Point group: D2
Chain length 371, copies 4
C-alpha cells in the first residue's frame, strides 16, 4: 500500500506539545509540518530540531521560506500573518509533496490511541458498499456519538434553526456505495462546541460511545480542522477561509474551518464522495480562552451561517474534480450574496462572500500553478 500521511499544525507555542504528539506520528512514519508565524518564538524551531533527531519527520519553515513559496506562486497577499490562517501553507506544502493524507490538527490535540494515523487512512480506502447514515432533516449531530455532560450539545458550526426539531428527525442506516475522502475525528474533554454552548453548559466529553458513521448525500455535519484527515484529491476544496471581515461592523473570527468544513463537504458530495465522523479520537485540553471574547468573535459568522447553508442546498455545483467544483462553489457564493435577505445581511455582510470567493479562486490558482 504505502500510504503517506502529513500532519499540518500551525502554532505560536514553544513546541512543548511535540513531546506527546511526536510518538504517535514517529511510530507511523508520518510527516509533521509545523507552520510558525511572525509572533512565534525561536523555541519552537529548537523543539522541532530536537524531535527530528529522535526520528520524527518534522519540518518547520520560517516565515521567510513560506513567503518565498507563496511569492513564486503569485499569491503573496493570500495568507495573512499573525493568524492561524497560515495552516494553509502546510496544506499547500503537503499537497505539493504528494502526500496521500493531510491531517489537519491543532497544537493542543493529542492522539489517544496508537492507531491514530492508521485510522485517518480511511480516506484512502476508495469506493465501497458500506453502511451509510442518513437523516430526515439533512443534518447529523456528531456530538451524539460522544458521552457528554451535563446535557446534549451540538458541534460548533451546526445551524441553529435546525437544532430544535432535530430530536424528531429520523436517523437511518443502509448499505450503499460511498467513497470516504474526509475523516473528522472526535475529541474528548472539551468538545468542539461554539462559544454559546460552552458559555451555557460548559460541556465535558467523557468517552466515544457511538462508533463511526459515513454520511449520505444530503446529510451534512460541520467539519473542523482540529482532527480531520483529507485525501489529497479533496484538499483543493479545504482552503481555510480568511477571517476578519466585518458583519455589521463586527469582524468575524473562529469560523475559518466551519466554512472550509462545509465547502469541502459540499464539493465532495457533488463528486460522489462522502464525509466520515468518529475515530481516531483525540484529547482536547483546550487553550485558555476568554469565552466572552470567543463569543464576540463568533457571533458575526453565526448570524449568517444558517442562511448560507440553506442557499447552498438549492444551488447545484459543476465540475469534474475538486478544483473545478470549488471554483464553481465560489461563483455560487457570490450569487447567494445578492439573493439572500435578512437583517444581518448588511452591505458588508454581502461583500464578505464576494471577497471570500475571490480568495478561494486565488487559492485554486496557486494550486494550478504547482500542478
Amino acid at each position: 500500500r504505502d500510504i503517506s500521511t502529513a500532519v499540518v499544525v500551525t502554532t505560536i507555542s514553544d513546541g512543548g506539545f511535540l513531546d506527546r504528539l511526536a510518538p504517535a506520528l514517529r511510530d507511523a512514519g508520518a510527516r509533521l509540518i509545523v507552520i510558525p508565524d511572525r509572533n512565534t518564538g525561536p523555541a519552537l524551531f529548537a523543539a522541532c530540531e530536537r524531535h527530528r533527531r529522535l526520528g520524527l519527520d518534522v519540518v518547520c519553515p520560517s516565515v521567510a521560506e513560506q513567503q518565498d513559496l507563496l511569492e513564486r506562486l503569485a499569491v503573496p497577499d493570500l495568507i495573512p500573518y499573525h493568524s492561524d490562517n497560515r495552516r494553509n501553507v502546510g496544506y499547500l506544502m503537503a499537497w505539493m509533496e504528494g502526500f496521500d493524507v493531510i491531517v489537519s490538527m491543532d497544537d493542543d490535540n493529542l492522539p489517544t490511541t496508537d492507531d491514530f494515523v492508521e485510522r485517518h487512512q480511511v480516506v484512502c480506502q476508495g469506493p465501497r458498499t458500506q453502511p451509510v447514515t442518513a437523516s430526515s432533516d439533512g443534518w447529523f449531530n456528531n456530538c451524539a456519538l460522544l458521552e457528554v455532560e451535563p446535557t446534549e450539545v451540538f458541534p460548533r458550526g451546526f445551524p441553529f434553526h435546525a437544532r430544535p426539531a432535530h430530536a424528531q428527525a429520523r436517523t437511518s442506516v443502509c448499505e450503499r456505495p460511498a467513497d470516504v475522502r474526509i475523516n473528522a475525528g472526535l475529541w474528548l474533554g472539551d468538545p468542539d462546541v461554539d462559544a454559546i454552548t460552552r458559555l451555557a453548559v460548559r460541556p465535558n466529553a467523557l468517552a466515544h460511545s457511538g462508533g463511526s458513521v459515513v454520511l449520505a448525500e444530503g446529510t451534512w455535519c460541520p467539519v473542523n480542522s482540529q482532527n480531520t484527515a483529507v485525501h489529497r484529491d479533496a484538499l483543493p476544496a479545504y482552503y481555510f477561509l480568511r477571517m476578519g471581515q466585518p458583519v455589521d461592523g463586527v469582524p468575524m473570527e473562529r469560523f475559518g474551518d466551519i466554512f472550509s468544513g462545509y465547502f469541502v463537504q459540499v464539493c465532495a458530495q457533488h463528486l460522489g464522495h462522502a464525509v466520515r465522523f468518529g475515530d481516531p479520537v483525540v484529547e482536547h485540553p483546550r487553550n485558555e480562552h476568554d469565552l466572552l471574547d470567543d463569543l464576540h468573535k463568533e457571533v458575526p459568522a453565526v448570524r449568517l451561517l444558517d442562511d448560507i447553508l440553506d442557499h447552498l442546498r438549492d444551488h447545484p455545483l459543476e465540475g469534474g474534480d475538486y478544483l473545478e467544483t470549488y471554483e464553481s462553489l465560489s461563483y455560487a457564493l457570490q450569487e447567494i450574496a445578492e439573493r439572500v435577505n435578512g437583517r444581518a445581511w448588511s452591505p458588508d455582510a454581502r461583500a464578505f462572500l464576494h471577497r471570500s470567493a475571490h480568495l478561494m479562486r486565488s487559492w485554486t490558482g496557486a494550486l494550478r500553478t504547482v500542478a
Copy 2:
C-alpha cells in the same frame, strides 16, 4: 389597606387583558397600561372594555404621557418605540401614592388567585426571618425551579461566577430583614439570556424550591417581568435606557438587568432585602429571533461582570433611595474610568457616563413631583 398598581407597557392589541384582568380585578389593583407610538387603537378599546367589567385600568395616550413628562422638565428622558416607556407607568403609580408597584410584561399571566396578595410581601416591614446567604455572593433563582433538560442561570447572572457556583456554600439562618423587592418566578420559558436559550432551550416545569430572602452581600439579577417593588424603593428602579453602542454594537434587552441590580444594591445599603419565589406566572414568551436577541445582549454581557465586581468595591451613601441612587450614579462614573479590559472602548465607558446622567434626570423628575 395596601394598594397595588400593575405596570405594563405594550404594543399588542390588548388581548392579554382577558387572562390578566381577573386576578387584578378581584384584588382591586390598578393596571397602568403604557402604549407607544407603534401601539394600535385596539388596545384602548380593550382597556375600555375591561374597565366596564370592573378593572381599574388606565391607558394614557402618548400625548398625555409627553404632557406629563414636559411638566416634570424631562421631555427627552424616555424614548418612544421602546419598552423603556414602562418608566412612565412607574412614575404614575408613584405619583398616585400606590404602596406596591408590580412590573409585568404583556405576556406574563398569573397562575394563582393570590397573585397580588403574594406581591404584597414588600409591605410587611422589618422582622427576623430566614435569610439565605451564599459563600460566593451569588444566588441562582432558577435553582428554585424544575428546569429541563439541564440547570440554567437567570438572564443577567455574571458568567465568570457560573463555573465555581456549584461549589458555593448556601446557608440559611434567622436574621432581621426588610423585604422591599419581590421577584416572582416564571413557568414555561424562564428568563434566561439568549446564550442559554440558544443552547438548551430550557423549559420550567414547576416551582419547587419555595421562596428565599437574600442576605447582604448575596446578589441575584432582578427582572421587570414579574416583580413587585415597594414605593420607597421605586425611585431606584428606573428602567435603564438601551441603545448605547459597545464597540459600535448597540446594546438592548438589559434595561431591567441594570435596574434590578441597581435597586438591589441601593436596597441593601439601606438595610433592605430582595425576595425570590412566589407568586409565579406562566410565560409563553412572545416570538423572538434568538440570534437577534443574542446580537442585542452581547454588548451588555461583555461589560456586566466587570461592572458588578466594581459595584462591590464602592460603598454608597444616602439616607433614602433617591439619595442612594444618585450616589450610585456617581459611583458608576468612577467605575467607568477605573475599569479595564478589551471590551472597555471609549464608547463603552461613555455608556456608563450617559446612563448616570439619565439616572439623575429620573431622580430629578421624582423630586419635582415630591
Copy 3:
C-alpha cells in the same frame, strides 16, 4: 444622419423641472426617459403626461414596469430602490431601444443654449484627426475651463495627491487621431465640486471661458452623470456604481458616477476612444444639501480613490469591445483590492471592490441577455 438621442433622468420630484427642460429636448426630437422610484409621488407621472401632449417624447415607467424588465433579464437584485442608482434603468432602456446618444442628466440641470442636444451629438462624429490635449502629470482640471470665484477649484472626484503639483504640470495640444465617445458638458452656477471644496470656498461658476478639449491617452479627468453624453457603444461601461458599502464602518455615497466616469474613461482609452469636456453647458442651481452630511457621505470614497486610480494606471486591460473591456476591468479591480495598502484599506474597504466587480459583471450579463 438621423442621430437619435435619449436623455436619462431619475428623480423623486413633482416634475416641475420639466417646464424648463422639455423645450430644449422637444425641439430636437430627443426622448426623455424619467426613472421614478418608490419614494416618488404621483405628481411626476401627471407632469410627464402633460408634457407628452405638448410634443415631448417622454416615458416614465412605474417601478412595477422597471422590476418586470429587470426580472426578465435575471437581475432582480441589481438595482436598489430609494436610490439614484435607478438611473441605470434609464441607461438600459435607452440602450435596448437603440438610441445613438444617451445623455445622463439630473433633475436640476437646465440647458442654457438651444443647441444642447446637437452639441452632445459630438460622441457620434467618429474618428478624426483633431486637437488633442495632454498633461504631463496625466490629469486635466476641467474646472479650469470655467470662470470660478473666489478661487480655483478641482472637480468632484479629482485625486487629491495630484492637486498640489498640478499647477506645475505642462499642458500641450497637438493634432492627433481621436474618437470621442463621451462628452462631459460643464455647469454654471454651482459647479460639480466635492463637499470638501464646497464647504471651503463655496465656488460659483460665472461663465464657460475655456472652450472644449479632447483628452489624450494617459490624461484623465473625472466624469459625472449630471450632463454627460455617452455613445451607445460605450454605454456598457457606464454602469452607475452601487453605493452604501462601508469604509471603516462608514457607508460611502455620492460617488456612483465618479467610479462610472473613470471606468468608462479607462475602457474608452483602451479601445482607442476619447473623452471630451466643454459644451453644452447647463445651469446648476443645486438642490438643498446638508453640506456636512454630503461630506460625511463622500469621505469614505475619497479615502480610497487616489489609490484606486494609481493602480488602474499600472493595470492594462483586455477586450475588443466595451462589454469585454468592462469585464476585464472588474477583474482588475479585484486584484487591486488585494495588492493595495494603506490605513484606509480595512477588510470592508477591500470587499467593497470585490462586490462592486460582481455587480459590474451582473450589469454586463443583463446587457448580453437583451443583445
Copy 4:
C-alpha cells in the same frame, strides 16, 4: 515681576529647542516639556543640553508624571500616546504658581524677540480699551493675516456661519475689558481645518490686521499652538480628551477646539476677554496625511455647530473659573439630551457626558493641590 511658563508636549528628538530656547532663555521663562511613552531618549539629552546653556527647562519622565497624577487621585485622566499629555504641563505650571501659561507645539517658532513680553498681555488687568464686536457673533482671526490664494477661516470656526459672515458688521469702541487669553497668530501654514487645507492649501504671508480684543457675545476659536492663558483662567483650559466615536468614527484633532471655546465662554461669564494677534509664530507644520486628518476631524465637525449654538442659550454660574468650568460641564450634559440632528447618535450624546465627567475630574485635581 511676571513669570511665564511655556508648555510643549512632544515625541520629537528635541531639535526644535535650538530655535525655541533663545526667545525663552532671554526672557527667563520656564519651558515645561512633556514627553510621552513614544518619546525617544534624545529629547532628554536635548533638554539637558539647553539647560546648561541657561534655559529653565524641565522634562519630567512618564514615571514622574504618573506619580504626580496618582497623588492627585487622577491616574486615569490623561492617556498616553496622545498630545492630551500637555495637560500635565498645564497642571505643573499652575502648581508652581506661574502667572502666564503659554501653550505651544514643538513646531511653532517665535518670529520676534518680544515673544514672551507680548504674551504677558494676559496680565495687564481690566481697563477701557478698543473692543471689537461682530453682528453675527463671530470673528475670523484669519482675516488679520494676508492669506493666499483666498480667504480662509480658522480650524473650529462653525460652518453654518461662514457664508453670511461676509455681510456681518464689525465695530470697534472703547469699553472696559480684562484680557485673560491671548491667541497669537501663525505665519506659513495657518491653523485651518483639514477641509480648508485640502481645498486651497492656504499660505499665511504676513500679519497685517494688528490685534483685537473681542467683546462679550463675539467668539472665535482658540487653539493651543501659540496661546497664553492667565493662571486664573487656566482651570478652564483643560485639553479635551479625544477618541470618542461619533457614529462609530473616533474624533481627534479637536481637543483644543473645545478647550479654546470652553475657556472663552467661561472667561466672558466672569467679565474677561480673549485677544487675537501678536505675538506671531512661524509654523512649518509637521508632516500630515491630510485625508487622515480629515477622517479624524469630521466626527467633531459634525457636532460643533450644534454645540456652539446651544452654549449661547445656556447661562453659566460660578464666581471663579473652577466653579464656572464645572457649571459648564453640567450645561454640556443638558445640551447632550436637548440637541437634535442626524449626527446625534447615542454615542455622540454620550461623548458630551463622558467629557463632562473628565472636566470635573480635571477640576477636582486642581482643587486637590489648591
